[PDB]
Every structure is written in C-alpha cells, then in structure tokens.
DNA sequence: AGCGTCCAGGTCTACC
DNA sequence: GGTAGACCTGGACGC
C-alpha cells in the first residue's frame, strides 16, 4: 500500500492542534499499556485507527500534527477542523495536564521527583468497546504478549480498512463478531489463552444480558462506584480490569487501576501497607484499600496521576 | 547449550 | 467476605 507519511515530507497532508510537549508526549503515552494499538512506523511518528479512520501523529514543541487516511478512494488532503477534534477528545485536550503535575507534585515529592523526567503523560479517551475487550486481554500477561493478541484479534474479526506499505490496518471488531461459541476456539487459535473464553463468554453477556451496545453508554453516564461494579459482571473482568476501564473509557478520572507495578509502586516506592486487613499480601480487600489510598493522596484525578507512575514504572 | 523457572497491567474457583 | 492456588503464553536469563 501506499507509504506511512511523515510530516517533513508530505506537509500538505498534515495540520496541526495546539498542545505542547508539557502537555502530551507521544512516546511516553501511545506505547505505555493504554491502547495497544499504536506503533511508531517511522521515527517519531505513530500510527493507529483513530475514530475509524487510520491516523499518524507527530509532534514538534509547540503541536500534535495529524494527517489521516480515508481509505474511501478520495484524493489525499490534510485533516478538516471537524476531523482534528476527534484527535483533540481521544488525547482529552481540554484537560490542562501541567497543572495537575503541579497538584501532585504539591502533595507527593516521589511523584515531583518522577514526573521532571515523565512529563506529558496524560490519559486517553478511548472506545469503550475496544477498552473493554484490550483489558479482558490484560490480565496475568504483559504489554507485548497483550499487543499481539489484541492485533491478531483485530485481523481476524475486525473489517479491513486500509494498508499502508505491508501493514494492514483493521477495526476493531464488534460485539455480534466476538460473540459466537466457534470465537472462542478460534481466539485459542491465535494464542489469548484462557482469556479467549473471557473475550466471548463478555461479548454474549453485554448482547443477550445488558441490552447490548447501548449499556457501555449507560456506564459512562452513571457514577464510578455503579459504573465499576456493572463491570465486573463480565467474565474476566476484576476489580483492576474495571477499573482500567472506567479510567481510561468511561470519563472516571477518579478510577486507580492497582496491577502488579502498581502494588510493587505503593511497597517500594510509598512504603505503604494495607491497615484494613491483617495479612498484608494482594488481595481483593488490599487492592481495594491501595486504590483507596491513591485518591486520598492525589485527589478526584488519582487515575491520571496513576498513568504517570505506571507509565514510567515501564521504563526501569 | 538450552532447559526450566520466574514473571507479566489478575481473575476464577474452591473451600472455610 | 477471607484465603489459597491454578492458570495460557512466551521473553528474560540463571544454572
Ligand atoms: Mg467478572
Ligand atoms: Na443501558
């Protein structure tokens, strides 16, 4: 297919949003466990499906610049306004990220301390759907396994979109496409593990159960509390699972997903202990008690100060 | 030399 | 509700 565009050579494709480097760094965030569907084709700019549409974004100090892919056969041209504020929602520009550093920098110095060398890394809007079904695909696993599985689940079920040089970009797939008993099998196939029968089994529930698609909009309607525990309903989905869901697709900037690095975080790095339970190891009253502790400590955006942590515990 | 254990964005099931 | 252990997969890497 046709080549991966950068912006230094193909500058009528591409427009700018407004966002410096204090406010977003594309590297820290695209490849850091939010969305797994994100890579960087050519040094310095990354490709994924945005909105329905394959995108690559880069960045100078000052702008995120877009250009976009229609793949509908219509003569290349740089992204309209209207298409660049799907770009603008997914990065939630509104949000002001430099001053929530400065809050929680204010409250936690070990934050302060982490944040000079991770700025920029703030927190994805991203489609319930694909949220939900990338983190059934999370758990007991790592980044790179989970990547794979979520794009070998993408080609398989997704519809095709567009290729770009040997890569082919898919969608992702739909609820009525997850949702058949031969799925399951098949996801084994391509490697998911016992997590293929959590893929399905959640697919069936939301369509013959919730009232299909319409219940993940309920769920970003409602409160973080109801939200989380409509959730975890849904075969394969735990407490952290939930809430990496509500954090990073259902508007709850409050939800402090607690995985392994986020235990090992609260150990090494607050030297914290659970003081609502005896034993003190993981556990389901632990884990609710450290999400507990991280709002206390961070306030109504715990979640988003969580993606920093997490984001640079990655990088030791 | 390469097997085998540990481990990774946890959840489920069984049992008290 | 608390506790404990199994669990698909494959890269890191000690022995
Ligand atoms: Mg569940
Ligand atoms: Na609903």
Same mark, same amino acid.
């Given at each position: 297919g046709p080549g991966h565009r950068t912006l230094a050579s193909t500058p009528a494709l591409w427009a700018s949003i407004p966002c410096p480097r204090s406010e977003l760094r594309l590297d820290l965030v695209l490849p850091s466990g939010q969305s797994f569907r994100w890579r960087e084709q050519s040094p310095a700019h990354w490709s994924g499906v945005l909105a329905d549409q394959v995108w690559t974004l880069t960045q100078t100090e000052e702008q995120l610049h877009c250009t976009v892919y229609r793949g509908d056969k219509s003569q290349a041209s740089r992204p309209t306004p209207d298409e660049l504020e799907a770009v603008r929602k997914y990065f939630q520009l509104d949000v002001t990220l430099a001053q929530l550093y400065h809050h929680w920098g204010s409250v936690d110095s070990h934050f302060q301390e982490v944040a000079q060398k991770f700025q920029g890394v703030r927190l994805l809007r991203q489609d319930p759907i694909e949220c939900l079904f990338s983190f059934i695909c999370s758990s007991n696993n790592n980044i790179a396994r989970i990547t794979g599985m979520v794009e070998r689940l993408c080609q398989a079920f997704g519809p095709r979109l567009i290729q770009l040089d040997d890569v082919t970009y898919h969608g992702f797939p739909s609820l009525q496409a997850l949702a058949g008993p031969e799925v399951e099998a098949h996801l084994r196939k391509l490697? /998911? *593990?016992?997590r293929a029968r959590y893929v399905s089994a959640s697919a069936r529930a939301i369509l013959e159960?919730? *009232? *299909? /698609?319409a219940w993940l909009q309920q769920l970003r309607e409602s409160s973080y509390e109801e939200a989380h525990k409509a959730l975890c309903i849904l075969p394969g989905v735990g407490t952290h699972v939930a809430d990496c869901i509500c954090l990073?697709? /259902?508007?709850?900037?409050?939800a402090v997903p607690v995985d392994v690095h986020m235990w090992h975080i609260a150990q090494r790095d607050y030297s914290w202990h659970p003081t609502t339970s005896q034993a003190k190891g993981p556990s389901p009253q632990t884990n609710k008690e450290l999400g507990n502790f991280f709002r206390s400590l961070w306030g109504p955006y715990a979640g988003w100060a969580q993606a920093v942590l997490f984001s640079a515990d990655l990088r030791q």
């Open positions: 490697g /998911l *593990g016992y159960e919730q *009232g *299909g /698609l990073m697709a /259902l508007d709850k900037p409050q």
